[PDB]
Amino acid sequence: ERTWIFSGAELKQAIEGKLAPDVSDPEMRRLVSVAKSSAYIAGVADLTSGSDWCGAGAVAPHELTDRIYTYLGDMPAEKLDEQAATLVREALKVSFPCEQ
Amino acid sequence: AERTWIFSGAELKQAIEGKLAPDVSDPEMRRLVSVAKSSAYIAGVADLTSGSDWCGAGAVAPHELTDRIYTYLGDMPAEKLDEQAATLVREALKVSFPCE
């Protein structure tokens, strides 16, 4: 019943530099791994900007990764097995809420 | 600047083509990092919208998503490709793999 490309656990591993399994090079596993996490987060952040979270023009990419990493660190194993993107949306919404 | 998005459509199209990692000097590594970014950006959008904007995640291979998105971005004029990539990914997925 898993159909998602990244789980929360895998996105957390990507941020930590651990999600380039098909890369044999060392000390360039890290570059590919964090490129995946940054780009996955960017997909969710770009799509949801101005709807689920606000202030895209005043937030640096590194700040998005930091908030998401903190949030994923808060999640128990059952939530981290679910799709990563919903967790990114939740992190952005609590971090950078839109005025209701 | 009016632009707040991390990837434009033009940048996602360049990433799929292996040309969005300018601070990576080894050519093969530039290509690997670039396509890692495109795959992960698309995955963020695809995972978030699965079962709502597009359907079939269990049966469609990741490479098929990239192929449909690349075709779709190739359909867009330059002004539209300057907009956020994620909404273009959602549009590509919705026309390619519609729900109900």
Author numbering:
A (entry chain A): 2 to 101
B (entry chain B): 1 to 100
Quote the study on this structure:
The type VI secretion systems (T6SSs) of Gram-negative bacteria inject various toxic effectors into the periplasmic or cytoplasmic space of the target cells and induce cell lysis of enemy cells.
The crystal structure of AtTai4 was determined at 1.55 Å resolution. The α2 helix (residues 52–74) contributes to dimer formation in the asymmetric unit, which is consistent with the size-exclusion chromatography results indicating that AtTai4 exists as a dimer in solution. AtTai4 shares 32.3% amino-acid sequence identity with SmTai4.
